[PDB]
Design a binder for these strands. Structure first.
Ligand SMILES: [Mg+2]
Ligand SMILES: [Mg+2]
Ligand SMILES: [Mg+2]
Ligand SMILES: [Mg+2]
Ligand SMILES: [Mg+2]
Ligand SMILES: [Mg+2]
Ligand SMILES: [Mg+2]
Ligand SMILES: [Mg+2]
Ligand SMILES: [Mg+2]
Ligand SMILES: [Mg+2]
Ligand SMILES: [Mg+2]
Ligand SMILES: [Mg+2]
Ligand SMILES: [Mg+2]
Ligand SMILES: [Mg+2]
Ligand SMILES: [Mg+2]
Ligand SMILES: [Mg+2]
Ligand SMILES: [Mg+2]
Ligand SMILES: [Mg+2]
Ligand SMILES: [Mg+2]
Ligand SMILES: [Mg+2]
Ligand SMILES: [Mg+2]
Ligand SMILES: [Mg+2]
Ligand SMILES: [Mg+2]
Ligand SMILES: [Mg+2]
Ligand SMILES: [Mg+2]
Ligand SMILES: [Mg+2]
Ligand SMILES: [Mg+2]
Ligand SMILES: [Mg+2]
Ligand SMILES: [Mg+2]
Ligand SMILES: [Mg+2]
Ligand SMILES: [Mg+2]
Ligand SMILES: [Mg+2]
Ligand SMILES: [Mg+2]
Ligand SMILES: [Mg+2]
Ligand SMILES: [Mg+2]
Ligand SMILES: [Mg+2]
Ligand SMILES: [Mg+2]
Ligand SMILES: [Mg+2]
Ligand SMILES: [Mg+2]
Ligand SMILES: [Mg+2]
Ligand SMILES: [Mg+2]
Ligand SMILES: [Mg+2]
Ligand SMILES: [Mg+2]
Ligand SMILES: [Mg+2]
Ligand SMILES: [Mg+2]
Ligand SMILES: [Mg+2]
Ligand SMILES: [Mg+2]
Ligand SMILES: [Mg+2]
Ligand SMILES: [Mg+2]
Ligand SMILES: [Mg+2]
Ligand SMILES: [Mg+2]
Ligand SMILES: [Mg+2]
Ligand SMILES: [Mg+2]
Ligand SMILES: [Mg+2]
Ligand SMILES: [Mg+2]
Ligand SMILES: [Mg+2]
Ligand SMILES: [Mg+2]
Ligand SMILES: [Mg+2]
Ligand SMILES: [Mg+2]
Ligand SMILES: [Mg+2]
Ligand SMILES: [Mg+2]
Ligand SMILES: [Mg+2]
Ligand SMILES: [Mg+2]
Ligand SMILES: [Mg+2]
Ligand SMILES: [Mg+2]
Ligand SMILES: [Mg+2]
Ligand SMILES: [Mg+2]
Ligand SMILES: [Mg+2]
Ligand SMILES: [Mg+2]
Ligand SMILES: [Mg+2]
Ligand SMILES: [Mg+2]
Ligand SMILES: [Mg+2]
Ligand SMILES: [Mg+2]
Ligand SMILES: [Mg+2]
Ligand SMILES: [Mg+2]
Ligand SMILES: [Mg+2]
Ligand SMILES: [Mg+2]
Ligand SMILES: [Mg+2]
Ligand SMILES: [Mg+2]
Ligand SMILES: [Mg+2]
Ligand SMILES: [Mg+2]
Ligand SMILES: [Mg+2]
Ligand SMILES: [Mg+2]
Ligand SMILES: [Mg+2]
Lengths: 23, 136, 59, 79, 192
RNA sequence: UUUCUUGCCGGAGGUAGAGCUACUGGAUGGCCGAUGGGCCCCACAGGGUUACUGACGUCAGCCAAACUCCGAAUGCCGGUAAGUCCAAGAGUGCGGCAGUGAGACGGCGGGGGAUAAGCUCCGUGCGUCGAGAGGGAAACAGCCCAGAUCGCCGGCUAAGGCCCCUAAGCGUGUGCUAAGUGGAAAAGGAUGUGCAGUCGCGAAGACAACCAGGAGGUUGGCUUAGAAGCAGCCACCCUUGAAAGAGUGCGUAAUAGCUCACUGGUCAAGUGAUUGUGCGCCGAUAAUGUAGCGGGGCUCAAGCACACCGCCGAAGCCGC
RNA sequence: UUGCCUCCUAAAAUGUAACGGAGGCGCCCAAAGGUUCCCUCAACCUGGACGGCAAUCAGGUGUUGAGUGUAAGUGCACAA
RNA sequence: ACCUCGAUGUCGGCUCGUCGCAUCCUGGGGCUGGAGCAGGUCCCAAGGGUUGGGCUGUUCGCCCAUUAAAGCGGCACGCG
RNA sequence: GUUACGGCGGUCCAUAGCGGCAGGGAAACGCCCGGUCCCAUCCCGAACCCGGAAGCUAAGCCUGCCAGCGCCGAUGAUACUACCCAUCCGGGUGGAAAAGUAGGACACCGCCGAACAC
């Protein structure tokens, strides 16, 4: 589940503000 | 195991698991207690294991109060089945626990043995708890 | 006493009472400002859109 | 594998239809309900299915009369 | 047995609210209210550290001498709103009191001494209500256990109550019950 | 102007929360004590004794989508005063011409599911995509900023950024981190480190290291071969007293011995224990190739927190 | 499973989906319809041959816990 | 039920490999209820090696004779 | 106008209730006496209905005082919440409970009639 975790966590960047499409 | 003799409705929604425990946050029956710190579903499996753990550790004489009751049923639809065809049949029982609620309470003469039995119980629970004393 | 209201944010992503409060204040674009009296109607009208504007009194 | 339920009836759109201080015609029905949750007040009549209606033109206003929520029609002055 | 009042400082809360209380609580201060027959609910910030220190030294029930902007008042702790988790005191209630004034209060009861070994002593009511003067309030009173006979109950009516204090609870409220220590074949038989 | 917004005024609710000795159910531990249980004297009368089970009641702590003595914020209905008003290009009515009726993800409230799915089904004067160009997120419909009339070899900014790639800071001040943490993760383990708060003793010399000991009643009574203090029960006794524990660990299978908790010493100031935290450590673990900062590189920070000072930056705003 | 009715979901106006959670309906009553007047239950204690907690009698306490043709909900003791 | 139904060929065997290490053998160790011989368990270690048959369509599996050993897996359950 | 009065009402119908203690009988309000007559009991002149004034404050009624039970109930805090910040944590500005505490309350207001100086 590395791909899912690592895609899902890049929403927590400063430029995304804790949100991103498809979580 | 702790099972209610009957519930008016046997298929409820999942208990809302938010907020801080408002009722039941003090140690009143015994002198030492285990007091919760995280939201969870404490099933009767966890409660039975923790109670037996405390009884095994103290093993002589002392009162264990399980002041939480598992009376809320979580259902589970049978395996290998697709979605639909209605809600499943209830097959485990739960107490809804908020951060703040004293779960188990103990009365025993000495200090260290009581603390150790309480932490032995804590290890059987799906949450972080702490040992709290009868005084502020 | 009376105020000057300057719009700093925009109305993209803004809910509808916020955009309408901005329109009722008479200002349309960013960095546009209006000057108006300091009664309770204006105070509420800018309370709605405080995150979109910045105000300062005159004097 | 089947649900033994899944039936419901139509919503009957019950509730208060005219609120306080609202001018009505004589005959307008003001609150649809089952029992008598609102009891008929002054110059307000009650229908067969416990529907409260106005027996005179005026303004709706609610009240409590001996522990009973009541609905009344108040005669507004003629201009 | 007069208890010396404890001297705190307090100052009138400028503005009220949850934001103001949170800020004051953040600066190491406790929001509190004076009331009583002083007929003026007066909103007072006081030092959190000193409040906790005096509550440690003299329990929940202790007279204070409040210095409100120079005016000097006698107060008594009525209630404390405390967080269930962080355990910090959030709010305090202060009846205004003066000398020669009876007041109803709740005093903790701590069992003292060792019991007979074959059985365990267990308290059901840890607090007993008493009527007593403002200065003469006991912060705690003891109940005797010294080798009791077989299991018996104890109620508030047979306690060595202090002088100048009066029981309020009905005398037949149980406080400490000696119950026989569960045997090996009796302790794990209850709970399921 | 009937639309919409904001202030005020008139309303009806039963949600969040809470409470339950206010109902319906669940449900913890006490207390008294029935009726029904057994027994005696002796009848199956009657009386009392007894683990009785222990109605009811009562004390204290609780729980609920289909519980409610209670109970908001918002929203909704109306009125009213204004606002916007060379515009919202707003309402409403009649008509001509439609397309649409497969939606998606994200925020908040929920059902189904295992409180799984980039799952599925609803609510939302919620948003964006659809039907949206431009800037940021390395790349990246739906996230953040901002809505493209055209031109300009002008300026100011937003999100994000300022060692080099790469425009602008190897910025200043005070601290923290040693893990390349920053630049993934759980239960749980842990003398990492900084700060704050109490507690025990402590130049009448305490913690460590160093020596003399650690006894007489007396191998306490339990089934067994010895429980003697070191399988497993009953718990915490006197004399010398300082120092002796119904004796702390090894091991003698039982003893003994090695020792210890505990007083005497020369030594010379700290010493031990929690609680709240700021950062870190371990747990840690897949298959083409570093490969869980975009790269180089970075602790001599280019990392983190708090203040402050500038600047860069869009098709946004201004200038012509 | 397909029409109708009631409740919860349903987020305090209305409305709101799922092979979500629970039940009813396809009748009945010439009075169980109209009006006029009159009354207050259930439960509990005490006293009574059958007769036992329990059946009918008497005294008291009893504001709603009874009942309302029929599900559920809203009502109703001013009484429905 | 997200791409593919105006076509992404579906098991086993053969040929040929390639990578991980969660080590089967060989190599280095700590603890043992390790005397030695031989083991048990954990840790480190991926360089090379890792057999031929009977039964069955077989994978799986059962067995036969060996061997230092006859490892487990990913690659469109690798490879038409 | 005075009233230890009698009626008819009202109040987001208990701050008014329950209970307890102590009083009153002018007219009134009652009880009380009887069933000849209207009228009545699913039997009962108990009720209702009709006639009367021997006795009464024992009740009902009303008056005064008690906070024991029931009721009402802040201020402050907290829960929850709208909107907005905010990389999960969390925070700010407005609204703000339930429970609990301080306390309140043994109702108040109105219109007619009765007796009384009038
Ligand atoms: Mg996984
Ligand atoms: Mg999502
Ligand atoms: Mg909810
Ligand atoms: Mg609690
Ligand atoms: Mg609660
Ligand atoms: Mg645990
Ligand atoms: Mg319905
Ligand atoms: Mg009708
Ligand atoms: Mg009809
Ligand atoms: Mg308006
Ligand atoms: Mg209003
Ligand atoms: Mg209301
Ligand atoms: Mg409801
Ligand atoms: Mg709730
Ligand atoms: Mg129930
Ligand atoms: Mg509810
Ligand atoms: Mg306008
Ligand atoms: Mg326009
Ligand atoms: Mg238009
Ligand atoms: Mg269609
Ligand atoms: Mg469709
Ligand atoms: Mg849709
Ligand atoms: Mg989808
Ligand atoms: Mg959701
Ligand atoms: Mg669902
Ligand atoms: Mg989806
Ligand atoms: Mg949505
Ligand atoms: Mg399309
Ligand atoms: Mg775009
Ligand atoms: Mg769009
Ligand atoms: Mg935003
Ligand atoms: Mg610039
Ligand atoms: Mg910026
Ligand atoms: Mg480049
Ligand atoms: Mg540069
Ligand atoms: Mg910088
Ligand atoms: Mg530098
Ligand atoms: Mg720098
Ligand atoms: Mg520095
Ligand atoms: Mg690390
Ligand atoms: Mg890293
Ligand atoms: Mg971690
Ligand atoms: Mg640890
Ligand atoms: Mg640290
Ligand atoms: Mg032994
Ligand atoms: Mg020994
Ligand atoms: Mg020694
Ligand atoms: Mg870098
Ligand atoms: Mg530009
Ligand atoms: Mg432009
Ligand atoms: Mg609704
Ligand atoms: Mg709603
Ligand atoms: Mg719908
Ligand atoms: Mg059916
Ligand atoms: Mg009828
Ligand atoms: Mg009839
Ligand atoms: Mg009766
Ligand atoms: Mg789909
Ligand atoms: Mg495609
Ligand atoms: Mg195809
Ligand atoms: Mg093709
Ligand atoms: Mg092809
Ligand atoms: Mg093709
Ligand atoms: Mg290959
Ligand atoms: Mg390895
Ligand atoms: Mg290997
Ligand atoms: Mg080896
Ligand atoms: Mg080895
Ligand atoms: Mg090599
Ligand atoms: Mg064959
Ligand atoms: Mg392979
Ligand atoms: Mg294949
Ligand atoms: Mg393969
Ligand atoms: Mg092939
Ligand atoms: Mg072929
Ligand atoms: Mg009352
Ligand atoms: Mg008289
Ligand atoms: Mg008569
Ligand atoms: Mg009298
Ligand atoms: Mg009377
Ligand atoms: Mg009340
Ligand atoms: Mg308040
Ligand atoms: Mg964060
Ligand atoms: Mg309250």
């Amino acid at each position: 589940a590395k791909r899912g975790r690592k895609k899902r966590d890049r929403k927590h960047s400063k430029a995304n503000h804790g949100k991103r499409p498809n979580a | 195991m702790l099972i209610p003799r009957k519930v008016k409705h046997r298929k409820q929604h999942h208990p809302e698991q938010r907020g801080i425990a408002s009722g039941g946050t003090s140690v009143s029956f015994g002198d030492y207690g285990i007091q919760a710190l995280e939201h969870a579903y404490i099933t009767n499996r966890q409660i039975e294991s923790a109670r037996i753990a405390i009884n095994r550790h103290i093993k002589r004489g002392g009162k264990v109060w399980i002041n939480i009751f598992p009376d809320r049923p979580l259902t589970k639809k049978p395996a290998e089945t697709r979605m639909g065809s209605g809600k499943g049949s209830p097959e485990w029982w739960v107490a809804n626990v908020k951060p703040g609620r004293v779960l188990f309470e103990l009365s025993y003469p000495d200090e260290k043995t009581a603390r150790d039995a309480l932490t032995r119980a804590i290890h059987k629970l799906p949450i972080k708890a702490r040992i709290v004393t009868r005084e502020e | 006493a009376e105020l000057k209201i300057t719009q700093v944010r925009s109305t993209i992503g803004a809910r509808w009472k916020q955009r309408e409060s901005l329109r009722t204040l008479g200002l349309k674009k960013i960095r546009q400002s209006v000057v108006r009296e300091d009664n309770a109607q204006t105070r509420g009208l800018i309370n709605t859109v405080h995150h979109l504007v910045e105000v300062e009194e005159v004097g | 594998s089947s649900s033994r339920n899944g039936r419901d009836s139509a919503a009957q759109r019950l509730g208060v239809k005219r609120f306080g201080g609202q001018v009505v015609k004589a005959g307008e029905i003001l609150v649809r309900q089952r029992g008598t949750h609102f009891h008929p007040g002054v110059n307000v009549g009650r229908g067969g299915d416990d529907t409260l209606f106005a027996l005179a033109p005026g303004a709706v206003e609610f009240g409590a009369k001996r522990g009973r929520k009541t609905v009344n029609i108040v005669p507004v002055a003629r201009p | 047995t007069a208890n010396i009042p404890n001297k705190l400082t307090a100052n009138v809360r400028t503005r009220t609210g949850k934001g103001a209380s949170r800020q004051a609580r953040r600066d190491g201060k406790v929001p509190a209210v004076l009331y009583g027959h002083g007929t003026d609910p007066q909103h007072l910030e006081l030092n959190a550290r000193d409040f906790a220190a005096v509550l440690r030294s003299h329990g929940t029930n202790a007279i204070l001498t409040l210095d409100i902007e120079g005016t000097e008042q006698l107060a008594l702790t009525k209630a404390l709103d405390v967080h269930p988790i962080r355990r910090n005191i959030q709010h305090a209630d202060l009846l205004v009191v003066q000398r020669g004034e009876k007041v109803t209060v709740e005093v903790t009861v701590l069992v003292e001494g060792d019991a007979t070994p074959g059985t365990l002593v267990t308290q059901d009511a840890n607090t007993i209500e008493i009527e007593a003067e403002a200065l003469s309030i006991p912060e705690q009173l003891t109940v005797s256990v010294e080798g009791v006979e077989a299991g018996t109950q104890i109620t508030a009516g047979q306690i060595s109550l202090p002088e100048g204090v009066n029981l309020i609870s009905d005398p037949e409220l149980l406080v400490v019950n000696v119950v026989e220590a569960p045997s090996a074949e009796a302790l794990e038989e209850e709970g399921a």
